[PDB]
Amino acid sequence: QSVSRAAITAAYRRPETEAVSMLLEQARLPQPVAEQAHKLAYQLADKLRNQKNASGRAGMVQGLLQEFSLSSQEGVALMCLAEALLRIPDKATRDALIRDKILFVNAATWGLLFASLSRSLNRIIGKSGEPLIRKGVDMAMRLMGEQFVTGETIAEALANARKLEEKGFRYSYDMLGEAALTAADAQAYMVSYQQAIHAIGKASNGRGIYEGPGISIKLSALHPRYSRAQYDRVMEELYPRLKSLTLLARQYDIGINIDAEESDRLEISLDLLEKLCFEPELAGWNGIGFVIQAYQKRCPLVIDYLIDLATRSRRRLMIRLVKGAYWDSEIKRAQMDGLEGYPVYTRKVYTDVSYLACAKKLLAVPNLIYPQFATHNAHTLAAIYQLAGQNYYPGQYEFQCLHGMGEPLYEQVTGKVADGKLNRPCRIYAPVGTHETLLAYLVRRLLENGANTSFVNRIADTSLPLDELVADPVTAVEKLAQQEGQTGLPHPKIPLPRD
């Protein structure tokens, strides 16, 4: 192994105290930068929460819960009466009714401002059995999944691109589908990716890899049973498909991004990337993209490897820095394999520290890397905005977000400074497909949106103060260290697998 590759292997399951301790000073924002990041993060998060005046309205609500000393159920019933009184057309009639004589239809709506289904479920299940549950799972998947899908076909998705592209957004299209089980499956995914590249490239129409749309692909879609595939067959069979797609993307001058999947496939994806970057037909072209996951202990070591690879292959790599989408499965997998540790962090704040440390490493080498900072977290965004320094230029970096999740944050970000935006570009990850391809992606979105550790979940909790929401992760880690006795202890509820 090379020096940078050997270091990656050594860090695979590095103990968490050691890994967090090493990243802390690399992630620490200088005090004036930290202060600017805090103010911007607070600002962004405030406008998020309080679009349509969510907090101010809630404030006026609780204020009247005090003056009259009433309960929540008491307040709602009062509003229903108040609403019915305001529907009396003439004020003299309304006042005379209040003075002399002294319904809940919209009580549910007012309640938003302030059991027997188990019987129906037990009854329905026993009668209809597994085929019923199977349809309900399919129906729920489609209904919850619609918000995350941009179109059923690439033509439909592309036809919708102008609205946000004219506001300064960019796109990366993903033909949904992954973990091909059979040779036919992987062949179908290959054809779907090829069709998409032709369509995206014609829409791009020469706009290039920065301003114009690109495509995102999953290696597991291009090789049957990728999860256990051996190096020899991957190089013989997957790599020609990856090369073919990348050459076609180059002909249209669109970016082609290799998504990151489960941690035990990191090594083989680096081998594929290494071979790809030295193809003569890709010489002098900078459209190859690659995702790295900051929740992995190997991430900073992968960056050192990628920096060396960009130098040796004489290109600028497009690198999407993410936290990671597979955390729940990674924990379970490691616990089942009984190894020495985890390949991912076990406290969410450590992943945040890793992301900031990695972001600094990426921003330091603008000749070698175009960083693409994927996040829906207002603090993460504000930190990167300050860490990138004075004198932004469009080709320095971009943000990225998922369709159906990013819009309210990035509406403050992409666009003109005169319109109150930050004037930084954001590329929207745009899934494309029908219900038959949606399941795995939707499940990962449910885990992301439903976790009480997720920014998108915490910002919707109006009982959590803004300052806690955008708290600096390095300071959070030091506070834990002072309380617990050392830096970087694992999550108390996630012991090592051999325990």
Ligand SMILES: Cc1cc2nc3c(=O)[nH]c(=O)nc-3n(C[C@H](O)[C@H](O)[C@H](O)COP(=O)(O)OP(=O)(O)OC[C@H]3O[C@@H](n4cnc5c(N)ncnc54)[C@H](O)[C@@H]3O)c2cc1C
């Ligand atoms: C445009 C885009 C493309 C992406 N592409 C990929 C990809 O190819 N591969 C991939 O794996 N991910 C990818 N992601 C990331 C993933 O889908 C989530 O969107 C992302 O991790 C959420 O981070 P956030 O900063 O928006 O949220 P935050 O809420 O600040 O962070 C949430 C993340 O913290 C991590 N986490 C949660 N709990 C713990 C814990 N107890 N210990 C340690 N870490 C924890 C998880 O990574 C979780 O997603 C992409 C994201 C975007 C926006």
